[PDB]
Design a protein around this ligand. Structure first.
Ligand SMILES: [Co+2]
Ligand SMILES: [Co+2]
Lengths: 122, 122
């Protein structure tokens, strides 16, 4: 009834989409979501609209879209809410489904923990 | 003797550099590093070279540079190593100081925890 769609920048190198894929798999393994899909903004497949439609086609009524970005970028505040038709302006139209657009990662202490670890080659 | 330099994309919007700033402050208050500086790749001050030199000027011999990026981008594999002169090609020259260039965040379970939380409006 609810879908989780992870959404990432995308890049010409594969690291970006590998990342979303591993993250998808780890949340699949937590057994918390009925449906879980990923979508890259640019130059990769699947795209956000594909991912969103791919979630409706499994019968989600509420789609939770989580931008896997650290900071609030232009992408997180113009392009993606556009793609989702949450802001008036390659568009995707859903039928009596609500898209729920979440917050990015931000300065979460868990990041600092990761950062600290990363400093020490851990 | 060792400096921690956090390093971020940077953007025309301020969110990016705010992020690095908050992260700097949180690791400052873990009391783990003698010196801690931040630096943005593009658009913002301070820049990476500024941040690196700013760390040498406090008498670091070993600078730990941690790329606060989720994925491995072009920026993490060409531009930043270039800026640090770790790869042959606004150059920075250090004197008999070693720069230690760490790994980015990647698909760390703590990210998934953050992601899961983020889905639930938390
Ligand atoms: Co972009
Ligand atoms: Co860039």
């Amino acid at each position: 009834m609810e879908a989780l769609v992870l959404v990432g920048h995308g890049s010409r190198l594969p690291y970006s989409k590998e990342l979303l894929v591993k993250l998808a798999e780890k949340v699949k393994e937590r057994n918390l979501f009925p449906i879980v899909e990923i979508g890259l903004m640019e130059f990769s497949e699947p795209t956000i609209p594909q991912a969103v439609k791919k979630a409706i086609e499994q019968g989600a009524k509420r789609i939770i879209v989580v931008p896997v970005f650290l900071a609030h970028g232009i992408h997180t505040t113009r392009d993606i809410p556009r793609l989702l038709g949450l802001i008036e302006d390659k568009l995707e139209i859903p039928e009596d489904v609500e898209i729920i657009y979440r917050e990015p990662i931000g300065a979460d202490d868990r990041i600092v923990d990761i950062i600290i670890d990363r400093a020490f080659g851990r």
